[PDB]
Design an enzyme around this catalytic site. Structure first.
Site, PDB file in Angstrom:
ATOM      1  N   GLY C  10      63.462  62.972  33.903  1.00 17.25           N
ATOM      2  CA  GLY C  10      63.121  61.957  34.866  1.00 17.25           C
ATOM      3  C   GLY C  10      62.281  62.478  36.026  1.00 17.25           C
ATOM      4  O   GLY C  10      61.953  63.649  36.175  1.00 17.25           O
ATOM      5  N   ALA C  12      62.491  62.725  39.331  1.00 18.08           N
ATOM      6  CA  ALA C  12      63.056  63.892  39.993  1.00 18.08           C
ATOM      7  C   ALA C  12      62.979  65.186  39.187  1.00 18.08           C
ATOM      8  O   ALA C  12      62.550  66.171  39.785  1.00 18.08           O
ATOM      9  CB  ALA C  12      64.451  63.584  40.517  1.00 18.08           C
ATOM     10  N   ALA C  99      62.021  54.075  31.532  1.00 15.55           N
ATOM     11  CA  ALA C  99      63.273  53.372  31.365  1.00 15.55           C
ATOM     12  C   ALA C  99      63.526  52.357  32.477  1.00 15.55           C
ATOM     13  O   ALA C  99      64.351  51.467  32.284  1.00 15.55           O
ATOM     14  CB  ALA C  99      64.392  54.370  31.134  1.00 15.55           C
ATOM     15  N   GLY C 144      66.758  55.590  35.533  1.00 13.56           N
ATOM     16  CA  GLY C 144      67.097  55.052  34.223  1.00 13.56           C
ATOM     17  C   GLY C 144      66.883  56.044  33.089  1.00 13.56           C
ATOM     18  O   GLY C 144      67.648  56.041  32.140  1.00 13.56           O
ATOM     19  N   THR C 145      65.965  56.997  33.281  1.00 14.67           N
ATOM     20  CA  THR C 145      65.775  58.144  32.411  1.00 14.67           C
ATOM     21  C   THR C 145      66.598  59.286  32.982  1.00 14.67           C
ATOM     22  O   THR C 145      67.224  59.932  32.153  1.00 14.67           O
ATOM     23  CB  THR C 145      64.307  58.561  32.344  1.00 14.67           C
ATOM     24  OG1 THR C 145      63.622  57.418  31.876  1.00 14.67           O
ATOM     25  CG2 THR C 145      64.064  59.732  31.402  1.00 14.67           C
ATOM     26  N   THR C 179      66.888  54.633  46.849  1.00 17.43           N
ATOM     27  CA  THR C 179      65.556  54.129  46.556  1.00 17.43           C
ATOM     28  C   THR C 179      65.593  52.927  45.619  1.00 17.43           C
ATOM     29  O   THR C 179      64.575  52.397  45.176  1.00 17.43           O
ATOM     30  CB  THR C 179      64.735  55.258  45.942  1.00 17.43           C
ATOM     31  OG1 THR C 179      65.310  55.592  44.698  1.00 17.43           O
ATOM     32  CG2 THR C 179      64.731  56.401  46.954  1.00 17.43           C
ATOM     33  N   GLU C 183      71.214  51.708  41.357  1.00 15.51           N
ATOM     34  CA  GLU C 183      71.578  53.109  41.317  1.00 15.51           C
ATOM     35  C   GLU C 183      73.057  53.340  41.042  1.00 15.51           C
ATOM     36  O   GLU C 183      73.295  54.190  40.186  1.00 15.51           O
ATOM     37  CB  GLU C 183      71.167  53.645  42.683  1.00 15.51           C
ATOM     38  CG  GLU C 183      71.577  55.082  43.021  1.00 15.51           C
ATOM     39  CD  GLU C 183      71.207  55.427  44.455  1.00 15.51           C
ATOM     40  OE1 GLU C 183      70.014  55.341  44.825  1.00 15.51           O
ATOM     41  OE2 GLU C 183      72.064  55.333  45.359  1.00 15.51           O
ATOM     42  N   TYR C 224      59.344  64.842  49.638  1.00 14.57           N
ATOM     43  CA  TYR C 224      59.925  65.276  48.388  1.00 14.57           C
ATOM     44  C   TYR C 224      59.450  66.660  47.951  1.00 14.57           C
ATOM     45  O   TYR C 224      60.186  67.345  47.247  1.00 14.57           O
ATOM     46  CB  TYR C 224      59.678  64.309  47.235  1.00 14.57           C
ATOM     47  CG  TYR C 224      60.637  63.147  47.174  1.00 14.57           C
ATOM     48  CD1 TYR C 224      61.611  62.878  48.148  1.00 14.57           C
ATOM     49  CD2 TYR C 224      60.447  62.225  46.138  1.00 14.57           C
ATOM     50  CE1 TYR C 224      62.424  61.748  48.049  1.00 14.57           C
ATOM     51  CE2 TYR C 224      61.194  61.043  46.071  1.00 14.57           C
ATOM     52  CZ  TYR C 224      62.204  60.810  47.024  1.00 14.57           C
ATOM     53  OH  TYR C 224      62.960  59.683  46.960  1.00 14.57           O
ATOM     54  N   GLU C 254      79.462  82.608  33.793  1.00 18.65           N
ATOM     55  CA  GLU C 254      80.425  82.924  34.837  1.00 18.65           C
ATOM     56  C   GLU C 254      80.849  81.672  35.590  1.00 18.65           C
ATOM     57  O   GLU C 254      82.041  81.467  35.792  1.00 18.65           O
ATOM     58  CB  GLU C 254      79.836  84.008  35.729  1.00 18.65           C
ATOM     59  CG  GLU C 254      79.888  85.313  34.955  1.00 18.65           C
ATOM     60  CD  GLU C 254      79.684  86.547  35.819  1.00 18.65           C
ATOM     61  OE1 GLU C 254      80.316  86.728  36.880  1.00 18.65           O
ATOM     62  OE2 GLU C 254      78.856  87.409  35.449  1.00 18.65           O
TER      63      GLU C 254
END
Ligand SMILES: Nc1nc2c(ncn2[C@@H]2O[C@H](COP(=O)(O)OP(=O)(O)OP(=O)(O)O)[C@@H](O)[C@H]2O)c(=O)[nH]1
Ligand SMILES: Nc1nc2c(ncn2[C@@H]2O[C@H](COP(=O)(O)OP(=O)(O)O)[C@@H](O)[C@H]2O)c(=O)[nH]1
Ligand SMILES: [Mg+2]
EC number: 3.6.5.-
Lengths: 48, 445, 451
Positions: C10, C12, C99, C144-145, C179, C183, C224, C254
């Site tokens: 996505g 992000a 998406a 959505g993705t 945004t 969400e 961003y 770990e």
């Protein structure tokens, strides 16, 4: 069903007494008899 | 002629490994190429203790290196002295250990222990007489912890009548370096109590006091810590390698220092230790050693042994020392601390005195004690266990390796027994005669 | 000889991939075209880049990384972008239509179509490795993705790779920012899925980082592009061991043994220090202990839930640069001493510790400045139950009306599954609450003379 935690931290509450284990010294039991009588009378004795 | 195998396992275990192999090699004038160049004929004399000969004045150590990853050992192989080692003896995985002792004892260390025993068969059969294995591992770790336990579980029965000498850094008395420290350590001791002849307890937090207090370092590294335990290891094995006035080897040390078959948890200490300044502002003698050798703040376990009683002590001197001046300081200690020893073992000290001092020192001593005080560590380890186990937290990573949720409690039951054994002997009384009731009787009036 | 696979999912995820790999080239001295700066040999040996890049050609280093969004824009801007010669074009994977913030499109009706295409290129990058460590996966909860195709991918990854670790790295949705409207539904429908399949997730938050950018970093007008470059400085410090030698080392396998006391509680929060302009570092010295206390201040946390609001269970410290282990042991012991820095009343050994010799480098000309030492930190804590309660309340308010439902159910997804996802999070609220209990097992609690 009102829902509860999926986890359950209570399970080891089945574990048994105890608490702890032993002690056991390697060959003798000194002073367990807690200082009661071990003889009778006493002072001058007999003769025939 | 008389021989030792070295094993290093886990990150700490391969760092005290890379520094012990600097310490002992430089003490032998072994070059970093693996060339022998020793500046005494007495260095070549017992070189078979720690090394095997190769082609054209080259030697390799009888050292075997284990990991479940390549990453630590790559820094051995690139770092100083890396080229003394046989590259066959580098035995490492591509798997990780995850700080999971089960991941070593049961699964991914189990996928490599046969390749370790491979190197134990190759190297241990260079020995005329193997006396023992020397193993530097973790206890609170996941790597060293998880590798020594299964390894001893096999070396202790290939070679059942050799000795088994362990240097183990332990969980910290005030912090954690790793989250699962209480679990790994409780489960490691459950294997090792049954199968080791000797275990030193080594505490960073005790060492970090020394770096502040005796060595007076501002940025103490691990390297600095590793030079003190490798100086310890070199020191305790000094009479194995050189002449002395009072010899001893690992078998002579264990029979005087282990009085019952589970009471082989020891703290070291080392003398001298000063700073680079303060050396000049005291003397150095047999009593100046002893002044620091007994002194609880200088122990490399932060137990403050004035909480408990010494069963047994070992003192392993290096450099020209005079016998009456050593013997009488060992006794001066015993009289003037008479409240800090066991009742039913008198003459508490095994004294060993060897000719050749350390590099860059004229005298030193290595101190090894056995005191019921050592309960301080294992008690926190037990309390920090049941704290975790009363809710069966973290267990799913261990059952994810097949470990039965019962062996966590077999270890807890073993830890209750073992910890109670220090308490059953601490200030324990001796067999003597009892009370007798008596009073006067009439003769005259 | 051992290897990691990264995945960007996505907008992000992709945009962090377009921030993180940039840093990873500088952190290794690699160039924007996957060359070393030179042909001619210099130095000798590692080349410690094997865990991140496959070596090809004349010594062209190809990053071990697959990229996915269902809009092509965001990956076309890498394909035409600055790093167009660094990435491989088979590993830059695009869709035809996003998406569109709908999980059911993401996970099913659109996302189904390239899952095998993605997995085959993942196979092909795993068969390239000498020893797979596992997966680091990048998304948001908003998308959505970022929800739909992440959750679908982690289902498939468990078929193909089983126990091999899967670690999540995620834009956790903010407490007062969003945004998007929907969400809170994409936020649950992924979590309901990935709790039974991933091994950890390490959260970070837009609004939190915005606050830090302004308060600490002195950035009035943050982007961003600052955000993801601060996020790359996180995961650089979570993977410093896998890139350099260090006094203490921490592998990818770990962190789950350390941070996860039960598989339901696998959601730490990630924090990093110091975060300041150069202009403020001239009125400071920034000791070890200073920077380690800075990782606990509520104003410095990069998930906005306040850590006064609960109890620590688990911690990992991740140092770089001028740090020695005593200084750390004393930083930790004095934080441990503070029972205001409160831990769950059962935890004894709260900390794990990593120490790298190598400092973070920065990108040139940009908003992030150099330090002599730095710390990342990963900590699991009861205090985040207020944000899970925020994701409860936000779901419940619209789902009581069945608002936006027809978009998901028009992708054929079921009202039954929707309700189970909310029910699994009603169980999760009781999961956080029970670890919050001071190991109570009778009818009250007890104490000694004083605490
Ligand atoms: N830090 C950060 N967050 C981003 C970035 N791009 C988008 N987001 C976050 O991602 C979430 C929304 O996801 P989208 O941007 O719609 O991406 P997506 O997953 O492709 O959405 P679809 O249209 O469903 O595919 C929100 O929380 C946004 O703030 C970015 O570059 N950096
Ligand atoms: N003395 C010392 N302690 C170390 C060194 N490296 C790691 N440690 C400590 O050793 C303990 C075990 O950790 P580690 O060796 O990382 O565990 P493992 O590799 O999983 O067995 C911890 O207390 C570490 O801080 C070292 O070189 N010297
Ligand atoms: Mg998209």
């Amino acid at each position: 069903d009102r829902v509860q935690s999926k986890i359950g931290s209570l399970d080891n509450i089945t574990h048994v007494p105890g608490g702890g284990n032993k002690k056991i010294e390697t060959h003798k039991l000194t002073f367990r008899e807690n200082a009661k009588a071990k003889t009778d009378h006493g002072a001058e004795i007999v003769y025939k | 002629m008389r021989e030792i195998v070295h094993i290093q396992a886990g990150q700490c275990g391969n760092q005290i490994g890379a520094k012990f192999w600097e310490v002992i090699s430089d003490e032998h004038g072994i070059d970093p190429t693996g060339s022998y160049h020793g500046d005494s004929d007495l260095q070549l004399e017992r070189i078979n203790v720690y090394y095997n000969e190769a082609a054209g004045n080259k030697y390799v150590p009888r050292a075997i290196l284990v990991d479940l990853e390549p990453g630590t050992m790559d820094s051995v192989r690139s770092g100083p002295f890396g080229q003394i080692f046989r590259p066959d003896n580098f035995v490492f995985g591509q798997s990780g250990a995850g700080n999971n002792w089960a991941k070593g004892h049961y699964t991914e260390g189990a996928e490599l222990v046969d390749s370790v025993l491979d190197v134990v068969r190759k190297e241990s059969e260079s020995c005329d007489c193997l006396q023992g294995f020397q193993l530097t591992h973790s206890l609170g770790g996941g790597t060293g912890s998880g590798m020594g336990t299964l390894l001893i579980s096999k070396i202790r029965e290939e070679y059942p009548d050799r000795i088994m000498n362990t240097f183990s850094v332990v969980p910290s008395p005030k912090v954690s370096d790793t989250v699962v420290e209480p679990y790994n350590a409780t489960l490691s001791v459950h294997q090792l109590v049954e199968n080791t002849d000797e275990t030193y307890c080594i505490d960073n937090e005790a060492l970090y006091d020394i770096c502040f207090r005796t060595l007076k370092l501002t940025t103490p590294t691990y390297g600095d810590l590793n030079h003190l335990v490798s100086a310890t290891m070199s020191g305790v094995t000094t009479c194995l390698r050189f002449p002395g006035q009072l010899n001893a080897d690992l078998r002579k040390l264990a029979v005087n220092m282990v009085p019952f078959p589970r009471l082989h948890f020891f703290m070291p200490g080392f003398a001298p230790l000063t700073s680079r300044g303060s050396q000049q502002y005291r003397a150095l003698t047999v009593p100046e050693l002893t002044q620091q050798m007994f002194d609880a703040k200088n122990m490399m376990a932060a137990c403050d042994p004035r909480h408990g009683r010494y069963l047994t002590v070992a003192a392993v001197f290096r450099g020209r020392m005079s016998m009456k001046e050593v013997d009488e300081q060992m006794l001066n200690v015993q009289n003037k601390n008479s409240s800090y020893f066991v009742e039913w073992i008198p003459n508490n000290v095994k004294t060993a005195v060897c000719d050749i001092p350390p590099r860059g020192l004229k005298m030193s001593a290595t101190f090894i004690g056995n005191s019921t005080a050592i309960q301080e560590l294992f008690k926190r380890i037990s309390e920090q266990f049941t704290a975790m186990f009363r809710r069966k937290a973290f267990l799913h990573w261990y059952t994810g390796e097949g470990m039965d949720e019962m062996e966590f409690t077999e270890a807890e039951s073993n830890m209750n027994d073992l910890v109670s054994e220090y308490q059953q002997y601490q200030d324990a009384t001796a067999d003597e005669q009892g009370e007798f009731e008596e009073e006067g009787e009439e003769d005259e009036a | 000889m051992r290897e990691c696979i990264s995945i960007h999912v996505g907008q992000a995820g992709v945009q962090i991939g377009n921030a993180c790999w940039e840093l990873y080239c500088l952190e290794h001295g690699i160039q924007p075209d996957g060359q070393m700066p030179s042909d001619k040999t210099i130095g000798g040996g590692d080349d410690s880049f094997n865990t991140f890049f496959s070596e090809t050609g004349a010594g062209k280093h190809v990053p071990r990384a697959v990229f996915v969004d269902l809009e092509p824009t965001v990956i076309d801007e890498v394909r035409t972008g600055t790093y167009r010669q660094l990435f491989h074009p088979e590993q830059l994977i695009t869709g035809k239509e996003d998406a569109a913030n709908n999980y059911a499109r993401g996970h099913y009706t659109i996302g189904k179509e390239i899952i095998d295409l993605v997995l085959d290129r993942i196979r092909k990058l795993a068969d390239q490795c000498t020893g797979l460590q596992g997966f680091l996966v990048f998304h948001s909860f908003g998308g959505g993705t970022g929800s739909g195709f992440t959750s679908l991918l982690m289902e498939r990854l468990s078929v193909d790779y089983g126990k091999k670790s899967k670690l999540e790295f995620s834009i956790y949705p903010a407490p007062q920012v969003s945004t998007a409207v929907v969400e809170p539904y994409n936020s649950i429908l992924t979590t309901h899925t990935t709790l039974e399949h991933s091994d950890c997730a390490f959260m970070v938050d837009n609004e939190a980082i915005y606050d830090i950018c302004r308060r600490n970093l002195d950035i009035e007008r943050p982007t961003y592009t600052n955000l993801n470059r601060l996020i790359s400085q996180i995961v650089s410090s979570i993977t410093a061991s896998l890139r350099f030698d260090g006094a203490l080392n921490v592998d990818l396998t770990e962190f789950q043994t350390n941070l996860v006391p039960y598989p339901r509680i696998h959601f730490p929060l990630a924090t990093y220090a110091p975060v300041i302009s150069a202009e403020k570092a001239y009125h400071e010295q920034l000791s070890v202990a200073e920077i380690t206390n800075a990782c606990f201040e509520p104003a410095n946390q990069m998930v906005k839930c306040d850590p006064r609001h609960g109890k620590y269970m688990a911690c990992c410290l991740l140092y770089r640069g001028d740090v020695v282990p005593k200084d750390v042991n004393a930083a930790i012991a004095t934080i441990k001493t503070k029972r205001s820095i409160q831990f769950v009343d059962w935890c004894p050994t709260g900390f794990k510790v990593g120490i790298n010799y190598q400092p973070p480098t920065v990108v040139p000309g940009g908003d992030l400045a150099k330090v002599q030492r730095a710390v990342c930190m990963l900590s699991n804590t009861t205090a985040i139950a207020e944000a899970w309660a925020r994701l409860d309340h936000k779901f419940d308010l619209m789902y009581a009306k069945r608002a936006f439902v027809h978009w998901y159910v028009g992708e054929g997804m079921e009202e039954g599954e929707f309700s189970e996802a909310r029910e699994d999070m009603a169980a999760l609220e009781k999961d956080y609450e029970e670890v919050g209990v001071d190991s109570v097992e009778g009818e009250g609690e007890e104490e000694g003379e004083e605490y």
